[PDB]
Scaffold this active site. Structure first.
Site, short mmCIF file in Angstrom:
data_model
loop_
_atom_site.label_atom_id
_atom_site.label_comp_id
_atom_site.label_asym_id
_atom_site.label_seq_id
_atom_site.Cartn_x
_atom_site.Cartn_y
_atom_site.Cartn_z
N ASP A 176 0.47 -1.19 0.19
CA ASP A 176 0.36 0.04 -0.18
C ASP A 176 0.55 0.88 -0.20
O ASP A 176 2.34 1.42 0.56
CB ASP A 176 -0.68 0.35 0.94
CG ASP A 176 -1.83 0.64 1.09
OD1 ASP A 176 -1.76 2.35 1.92
OD2 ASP A 176 -3.59 0.60 0.48
N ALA A 206 -6.83 -1.67 -4.83
CA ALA A 206 -6.27 -0.27 -4.21
C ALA A 206 -7.26 0.68 -5.49
O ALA A 206 -7.73 -0.04 -6.69
CB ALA A 206 -4.98 0.06 -5.37
N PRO A 207 -6.91 1.80 -4.70
CA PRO A 207 -8.01 3.16 -5.37
C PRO A 207 -7.39 3.03 -7.01
O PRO A 207 -6.44 3.20 -6.84
CB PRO A 207 -7.95 4.12 -4.32
CG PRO A 207 -6.56 4.43 -3.90
CD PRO A 207 -6.58 2.44 -3.53
N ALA A 234 -12.19 -4.57 -8.00
CA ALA A 234 -11.18 -3.31 -7.94
C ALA A 234 -11.96 -2.32 -9.07
O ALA A 234 -12.88 -1.97 -9.27
CB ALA A 234 -10.02 -2.68 -7.61
N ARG A 235 -11.49 -1.67 -9.96
CA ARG A 235 -11.75 -1.06 -11.08
C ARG A 235 -10.36 -0.77 -12.13
O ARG A 235 -9.73 -1.86 -12.33
CB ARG A 235 -11.10 0.87 -10.53
CG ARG A 235 -11.72 1.25 -9.89
CD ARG A 235 -13.41 1.23 -9.76
NE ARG A 235 -14.65 1.88 -8.60
CZ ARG A 235 -15.92 1.46 -8.48
NH1 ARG A 235 -16.40 0.82 -10.17
NH2 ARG A 235 -16.42 1.71 -7.58
N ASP A 259 -13.35 -8.95 -12.14
CA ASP A 259 -15.04 -8.20 -12.17
C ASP A 259 -15.28 -6.95 -12.69
O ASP A 259 -17.17 -6.21 -12.98
CB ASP A 259 -15.32 -7.95 -10.57
CG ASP A 259 -17.00 -7.91 -10.91
OD1 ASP A 259 -17.98 -8.53 -10.85
OD2 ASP A 259 -17.03 -7.04 -9.36
N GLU A 264 -16.22 -1.24 -19.59
CA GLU A 264 -17.43 -2.21 -19.38
C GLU A 264 -18.47 -1.78 -19.41
O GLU A 264 -19.29 -2.71 -20.44
CB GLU A 264 -17.47 -2.98 -18.08
CG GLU A 264 -17.75 -1.91 -16.74
CD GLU A 264 -17.15 -1.86 -15.65
OE1 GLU A 264 -15.93 -2.56 -14.93
OE2 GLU A 264 -18.24 -1.32 -14.67
N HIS A 297 -18.97 -6.75 -12.93
CA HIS A 297 -19.26 -5.56 -11.75
C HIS A 297 -20.77 -6.08 -10.04
O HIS A 297 -21.15 -5.67 -10.37
CB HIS A 297 -19.46 -4.84 -12.25
CG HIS A 297 -19.24 -3.36 -11.16
ND1 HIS A 297 -18.81 -1.98 -11.37
CD2 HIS A 297 -18.48 -3.34 -9.92
CE1 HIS A 297 -18.23 -1.55 -10.94
NE2 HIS A 297 -18.37 -2.51 -9.92
#
Length: 331
Positions: A176, A206-207, A234-235, A259, A264, A297
């Site tokens: 992190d 993580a962001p 996450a993203r 996911d 997407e 998602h």
């Protein structure tokens, strides 16, 4: 208090109703997301809206809400990028979100993907579904208790993922940007390079920081163990999708589970069977099944997560209605 709730799945309806027992709101649920003018006009007569993802509170739709006299704009999500927050503030809209809800909802999905890959059960069952019961070498597996698992991003979700993998017997390490205290019983915090060097499984929590770009780059992948597993719940923008495709094709990655994808919205929620996908990366990812697994998602698509998202949202509205303020007021 009249509240319009968008993007309401029929499975969610009982949760909206049950959570409303202590609030007494006059709720209406629609399946529509916020997009066209006409979806914004649905809010005629309402005091508040509860948005979710893919509900675009842009200049057009915020002007319509103001004209209609909507007082409160909530989103039942941790993400707020679908709202034009600067313009909402300019118009004077009080807004709230749901920064904290079931971390286990996402973490368990990450873990289930990782195991489906580690133990080759997606591959195997994709075969037995077709009456192919042969056993091959790719099917031979490690045990997660003998693995090192790497968590990239030790926020709320990441820590719970580490706890879960630790509880299954893995050795967990993680990275992190900040020193994360109180994790020592279940995770050792180390450098990214140590995570890449040592991990049989890597899960991303993580962001996304737009100025950093993707965390999973060509160079990230190159440092991984050959045959390691990577999971991204996450993203989408945290991974360079093409670079991952190449690492799956080369065998650098044994498997990839996700996911979320960069772009997407072009596929998620749609049934595109028999069609050529418009994004050729997505066509490849689908073709790589079962060594790439895609879920649309669903990381927060649990009963507990949706209950949390709906209940925090109701509380946020009550806070705003009674006090003009709320702990989750969008800043």
């Amino acid at each position: 208090m009249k509240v319009l709730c968008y993007g309401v799945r029929d499975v969610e309806l009982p949760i909206f109703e049950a959570c409303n027992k202590e609030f007494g709101y006059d709720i209406k649920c629609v399946p529509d997301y916020l997009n066209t003018k006409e979806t914004a006009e649905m809010a005629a007569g309402f005091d508040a809206v509860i948005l979710r993802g893919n509900c675009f509170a842009n200049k057009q739709n915020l002007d319509i809400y103001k004209k209609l006299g909507v007082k409160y704009i909530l989103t039942r999500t941790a993400g707020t990028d679908h709202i034009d927050k600067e313009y909402a503030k300019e118009l004077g809209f009080p807004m709230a979100f749901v920064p904290r809800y079931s971390p286990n909802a996402i973490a368990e999905l990450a873990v289930t993907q990782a195991m489906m890959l580690l133990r080759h059960t997606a591959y195997t069952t994709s075969r037995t579904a077709k009456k192919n019961f042969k056993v091959d070498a790719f099917m031979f597996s490690k045990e997660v208790r003998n693995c090192t698992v790497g968590v990239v991003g030790l926020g709320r979700i990441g820590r719970v993922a580490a706890q879960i993998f630790h509880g299954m017997g893995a050795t967990v390490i993680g990275e992190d940007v900040f020193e994360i205290k109180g994790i020592e019983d279940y995770c050792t915090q180390v450098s990214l390079d140590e995570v890449l060097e040592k991990s049989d499984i890597i899960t991303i929590h993580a962001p996304y920081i737009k100025e950093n770009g993707a965390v999973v780059t060509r160079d990230f992948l190159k440092k991984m163990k050959d045959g390691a597993i990577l999971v991204n719940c996450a993203r989408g923008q945290l991974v360079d999708t093409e670079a991952v495709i190449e690492a799956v094709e080369s065998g650098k990655l044994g498997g990839y589970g996700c996911d979320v994808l960069d772009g997407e919205a072009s596929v998620f929620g749609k049934d595109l069977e028999g069609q050529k996908l418009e994004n050729p990366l997505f066509e490849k990812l689908v073709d790589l099944y079962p060594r790439v697994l895609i879920t649309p998602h669903l990381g927060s698509y649990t009963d507990e997560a949706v209950k949390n998202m709906v209940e925090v949202s109701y509380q946020n509205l009550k806070d705003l209605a009674e006090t003009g303020d709320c702990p989750n007021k969008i800043k």
